[PDB]
Each structure stands twice: as structure tokens, then as C-alpha cells.
Design a protein around this ligand. Structure first.
Ligand SMILES: Cc1ncc(COP(=O)(O)O)c(CN)c1O
Ligand SMILES: Cc1ncc(COP(=O)(O)O)c(CN)c1O
Lengths: 412, 412
């Protein structure tokens, strides 16, 4: 895995911000795209754009073939059994909302429980809040360990015989924690619950095997894995998807339409209403081809190296707090003592470095951490150890700057 | 308006299918894109892709500026009062589903009525079926005239004091009918109902003024108006959107998130959950710039010329039936006597001509027309009268071919 050869394919990396070479460390917010993906979109719009689900003309046939072949690429990518289990959506948020609407709100009675965690992204919190409110069920939270991980015994304690759904993140976009998804799946199944995996942060950076995880549902976003914006995937076990009603209604998802009643298509098109995200889905397939040619295990090893290096170099900094465990994905969420993270991000961008500051759409996690906001640098396959050196040097410069600005008007 | 200069900007038009120059007459299924839109997507992914809703780094600021500027472009394009009334969605289908979920299902009691028409696309039928089923309300249909138009007195007869929603198409993708949207809006308001305009087929081809139409909701799709796939718009009057609950929940649309309760953002972000369709929305803004530079009135005049020419030349054909009125948008839906429309589309594609065959996602309209399927050729700003000549010549050739294949084995 040659990182220079990889960076060469991402045109956006080769520019300056504020007179400094761009150092993009915000891939958890969104990832950048290689030329393969952009040129896939270009070839689609230049050569064979047409509405899909063929039968009539040539460009329509080519568009349909591209779209459904991207579906098959996704099926192979996460090791789903059937294309009927692969639903193209707007993103992770929409997929989780679909599960909450068509599964949760249809399978929850008073006394039932939906169990989530304190580290969940808002996308994996608010749909369940609304579903339990609509059904009169109960929302429960699995507590976290001191290092930001989840113990299996806390899972067994929180999940009960009344738990119908356990919704959990595969990888936390804040803590870097990789949750024991497989063991949690078996624990949930032992109590008669299904499991809903938020895999927005796992899918871009590590191999996904839905058959080995035995997840009942799995959600992912294209924009985080070198793919186009506005497209994502809902995977669900075919037996569960067959008994769920559609979340959206309209053309393409119908079979027979009467004046007052209608019948739906078979999976997966039952859950894809209207003209689909054709170009975006084909580009997501191109992104999958790109990542597979590089190898997800290679990318994960590279990110392990980056994360270990970054954790050590952060521990070389005085007055910096890092949140989460030692064993982690490729990201570091932190805070400088007596410097607000927003100012940290501002100064870093002045140095050309792109990080994120705020709650990272995980307010309950922020309150569990006893902070209002944090700063975060996230890595991907195009990032290098030199960029982490620049990051820690800029953090030291920031510490010194806000220190001596403080001492100067103390004297004044 | 120079049609050669316009065609020069669409690379996909300059290719051959089955050894014949491409003749794309399927723009009602989807439209093709100029270089301005494709290169807008390219510049986004090459230069300033980042997650939006800024505050931290430079590329994020540029991405946010592009996204919200596209929102402002849309507001100007349809003459909405405020950007708070412009919601980016997945497409027309999703926008109509949002209105049916968050307005209809919250404002319908038994005895209430939702009134639609027989010419409606499935996107403007099935959500209302499901909403009236969920609320115990009643679905009603406005009858059609013999020429496929809607009389205002039939509207006054169907809409009653119990009608809460009137959902109607601005332009029929099958009949070519332009419905009297403004008069229907006032009729609906006189009875205490809101009006929901399906403008997927109107927006690409004619000027939209939501303040002059006085539509309560208006839906549109980017892929039909030279814009990227997977993005559309829901417009709704700000006063109605303020009292509607969100259709989706997650990050970006929240303000405060507690363990069990949450508060929403102000409009329009209340209705945009998760990472939005950044590139697609910016490209839709580019498509709006393109169409405005050409001029929607110019495009509408060109399509009027094309439609009149096509209707005359179709009337020069023996044994061909055309459906709809004389005054129409730029499309012709038809049938050849004793030739199934699917065979018509097949032969036409063999001649390089791209038309559509089937129900066009309007099965109740097909049954009203007393046919099972039809063929359809739809026009846009890059189509010419020479292409219509090729179409009618291929239809005559098809008539003669299926005639003499029939006579040859009659003799055999
Ligand atoms: C008149 C009409 N209504 C609504 C739709 C559905 O729009 P979409 O598939 O983009 O969601 C279509 C499909 N072209 C249409 O032409
Ligand atoms: C872990 C996690 N969960 C879910 C989401 C939401 O995904 P999206 O905004 O693409 O819908 C995010 C946002 N990056 C995330 O990182």
C-alpha cells in the first residue's frame, strides 16, 4: 500500500489553504474522492444517463445495468446473502429512520424496550426516541466503561426479555471505540431482540461481514467511504424486510395500483420509491471497486499505524486530554487545557489543517464525558504520519500562543 | 435560442445507438445534463468537498456556502418568499411523501377528504392512499374531460367542506395537460383545504411562481431539469412548515438532544436530517443557472413549437391514436393500431430513437384511457423538428413492417 500513489488519485488534496499545504484531518465528517469515482460520475452523465429499470431503449438498459450492478457490488462488499437485502437510501440517517418507521413502530407495544448506548450518533438516537414515543415503549441506555468501551455484562444487564431492538454503533465517530457487534448480536437474539448496527464509521475503514456479525440491520453512508454524497445503504435480513411495510410510497415500488389500494414490488425495490439515486449509486459501486482494489485490511492496518502514532505524539503534549480507549479506529478526539476546541480548529485551519470542533452530533456522549465540546482529527487512507506531525506541532504552537496571549494582558 | 449551440453542451447527445445517430425522446423519464452541471459536480469533488454547516475550516465553509447558495438559487427560481420554505429532498416522490406523512397524517380525521385526479403520477397517489388509510379519511378523484383536461366545475363539485387536501399535478407526464393550478388553489382554499402541486413535469419546462400559483406545497425533481439524480425540492408555505413535525430524525436537524427528548432546528434544516445531498444540490443550482441563462419562457416556446409540429405530423399518420388535449406540454403519448407499444419502442431503439413504453406510473389513467399501455415521446430544450421527423418516419416504417409481417404468414 503506497500512500503517495494513493494521494496522487485525490485531486482535492493538492491545494493550499491560507498559504499552507492542505492537511485534511476531517474524514469522519466526510471523505474525499479518488479520480475513479468522479470519472465514474462523469462517464455516467456523459454517456449513458437514463431512467432505470429497462426494457425499452439502449441508454436505459445501460443505466439499469449500472445501477443494479452497483447493488450487486454492495452485496459482495458487505457479504450479504442476496441483493434483495441491499436497499439504496439517502444515507445512514435515512436507513436508520426506515428501520425505526417500518420495523420499530410496527413491532413495539407498551412494556417493550429499545436499548441503545451513550456513545451513539444522533442518527442512531432520535429515530428511536420518536419510535418509543409513538408506541409507548421504553428507551434504555447501555452504560459505558471508564475508557469509553462497552462491557458485555452491561449489555446482558441492560437487554432484557422485553427488549425488542438493540441499536448500537459499530465504530464511534468520537471515541474511536470498535464495539463488540457480534457478541452483542447474540446477546440481543438470546432475549428475542433484533440488532441494528450503525456502520457509518466502520464501513469505510474496515471489512464488513454481515453474515459473521449476524446483524439484523446494518446502515452505511457513501460520502464517508470515498463515494458520492446523498447515497447510502440499508442492509436487512431478507426475512425481516419481507414483513416490513415500505417507508415511502410512489412509482417504481408498486406492482398493481388501484384507485384506493395498491400492491408492492418484491425486495429490494419495495423500499425504493420514485426515480432512484442512479449516478450516486453507480459512483458508490466505483468507490467499492477502488477500496477493494486497495484492500480494506490494508486500509485498516494503515489506520492502526496512524492511530498508534497519533496517540503517542498526543501523549507527548502537555495539557491535552484524549478521550476514548487505546485500541481504536483512526481518529483522535481531544481538548486543549483552557482553550476552547472551536478556537483550536480556527487556528489549525489558519495553519492549513482541517479538523472539526463541537459535539460531533453526540450530545449525550459529550455530557457523559463532562464536556460541552471537543476537537477531532479523523484519518483515512490518504493521510500520513507527517500530517500528524504537523497536527501535533500546530497544537503545541496553539498551546504556546494562547498561553502567552494570556500572560501578556495579565501583565497589562 | 440557438438549438445547435444548446445541443453542443450536452455530450451524451453525440453518439450512435445501433449504428444510428441517437435521437433521445424520453426526457419525461429523465433529462440529460449540460457540461455546466457535470463540471459543477467535478469542481465540487475536486476542490471543496467537505461536510457542510461551517464554522471550523475553509473547505467546510466553501461547501456550506455552495449548498446554501444553491438553496437561495432554488428560492429565486420558483419565487418562494424565503429560503426557510425550500427543503432539499431525494426527489418529488420523497417530497410528496413528506407532506403526506407530516401534514396529512397529522391533519386528517374520519370524514375528512383528500381529493386527487385520475391523471396523477403514482408518486401523487400512493402516499395519499396510505395517509387516508392511516387516518380513516376518504380519498376522492376529480373526473377528467373527454380530452384529458380538468374542468373547474368538476373541481368545485368534488372538493367539499370536508376536503382538507387537494393534491394535483401541474403538468401530466402522459396527457401533456397543463392543469389550472391557480384556480384550483383558490377553489381548495375556499373550502378550507390546502393544495399540493406535483410539479415534477412543469418545473423543467416552464416558469414556476409559487406566489402567483398560491400553492401550499410544491414538489420537484432535479433529474428532470438537467440536474443531478437523487435530489429534489419540497416547497411549502412557511406557516404550514412551522407546524409540521419532521419526517426524518437525526443529526443536523436537532437543536438540543437529551436522553429521551429533543428539540428541532428552525426551518428549513428541521426537515433535512443527516449529512445532506451536498454535491447534488450544488449541481441542481448549476442547472438552474443554466436554464435561467437560456430562459424558461424561451424553452417553453420551443416546446410549444415542437408539440404543435409533432401533433400535426402524428395526424399525418394513419392508424395512430394520440391521447390528451391539443394545448399541451412538449410530449406525445400514443399507440399504433394493432402494435403493442413495447414493440414500438423496441423497433424505434433499433432505429436509434429512445421513447418509453408502458403505464408511465399512471395505471388509473391507463384504465381511464381504456388501454393497458402506451408509447411516449417527450421533448426538452435540446430536441429538434428533424428528430420528430425521424420519429414519425420510424413510426410509419413500423406500421408497414408489422403490416407486411402480418400479411406474409397470413399467406403462409
Ligand atoms: C409528473 C410526475 N410526477 C412525479 C414523478 C416522480 O418524480 P421522481 O421519480 O423524480 O421522484 C414523475 C416521474 N418523472 C413525474 O413525471
Ligand atoms: C458514526 C456515525 N453514525 C451515523 C452518521 C450519520 O451518517 P449520515 O450523516 O451520512 O446520514 C455519522 C455521520 N458521519 C456517523 O459518523
Amino acid at each position: 500500500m503506497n500512500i503517495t500513489d494513493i494521494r496522487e488519485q485525490f485531486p482535492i488534496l493538492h491545494q493550499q489553504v491560507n498559504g499552507h499545504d492542505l492537511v485534511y484531518l476531517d474524514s469522519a465528517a466526510t471523505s474525499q474522492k479518488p479520480r475513479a469515482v468522479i470519472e465514474t460520475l462523469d462517464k455516467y452523465y456523459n454517456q449513458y444517463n437514463s431512467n432505470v429499470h429497462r426494457g425499452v431503449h439502449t441508454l436505459g438498459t445501460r443505466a439499469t445495468d449500472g445501477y443494479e450492478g452497483a447493488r450487486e457490488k454492495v452485496r459482495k462488499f458487505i457479504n450479504a446473502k442476496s441483493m434483495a437485502e441491499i436497499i439504496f437510501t439517502k444515507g445512514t440517517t435515512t436507513s436508520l429512520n426506515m428501520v425505526a418507521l417500518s420495523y420499530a413502530r410496527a413491532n413495539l407495544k407498551p412494556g417493550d424496550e429499545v436499548v441503545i448506548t451513550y456513545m451513539e450518533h444522533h442518527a442512531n438516537i432520535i429515530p428511536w426516541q420518536q419510535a418509543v414515543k409513538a408506541t409507548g415503549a421504553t428507551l434504555k441506555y447501555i452504560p459505558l466503561q471508564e475508557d469509553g468501551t462497552i462491557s458485555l455484562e452491561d449489555v446482558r444487564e441492560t437487554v432484557t426479555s422485553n427488549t425488542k431492538i438493540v441499536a448500537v454503533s459499530h465504530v464511534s465517530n468520537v471515541l474511536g471505540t470498535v464495539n463488540p457487534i457480534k457478541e452483542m448480536a447474540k446477546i440481543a437474539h438470546d432475549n428475542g431482540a433484533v440488532i441494528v448496527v450503525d456502520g457509518a464509521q466502520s464501513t469505510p475503514h474496515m471489512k464488513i461481514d454481515v453474515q459473521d456479525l449476524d446483524c439484523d440491520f446494518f446502515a452505511l453512508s457513501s460520502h464517508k467511504m470515498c463515494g458520492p454524497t446523498g447515497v447510502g445503504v440499508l442492509y436487512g435480513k431478507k426475512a425481516l424486510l419481507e414483513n416490513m411495510e415500505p417507508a415511502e410510497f410512489g412509482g417504481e415500488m408498486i406492482d398493481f395500483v388501484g384507485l384506493y389500494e395498491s400492491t408492492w414490488k418484491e425486495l429490494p425495490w419495495k423500499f425504493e420509491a420514485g426515480t432512484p439515486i442512479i449516478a450516486g449509486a453507480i459512483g458508490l459501486g466505483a468507490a467499492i471497486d477502488f477500496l477493494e482494489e486497495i484492500g480494506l485490511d490494508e486500509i485498516s492496518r494503515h489506520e492502526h499505524k496512524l492511530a498508534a502514532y497519533a496517540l503517542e505524539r498526543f501523549r507527548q503534549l502537555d495539557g491535552v486530554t484524549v478521550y476514548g480507549p487505546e485500541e481504536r479506529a483512526g481518529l483522535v478526539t481531544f481538548n486543549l487545557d483552557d482553550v476552547h476546541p472551536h478556537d483550536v480548529a480556527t487556528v489549525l485551519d489558519a495553519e492549513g489543517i482541517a479538523v472539526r470542533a463541537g459535539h460531533h452530533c453526540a450530545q449525550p456522549l459529550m455530557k457523559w464525558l463532562d464536556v460541552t465540546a471537543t476537537a477531532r482529527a479523523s484519518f483515512y487512507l490518504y493521510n500520513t504520519e507527517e500530517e500528524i506531525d504537523k497536527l501535533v506541532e500546530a497544537l503545541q504552537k496553539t498551546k504556546e500562543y494562547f498561553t502567552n496571549v494570556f500572560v501578556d494582558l495579565e501583565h497589562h
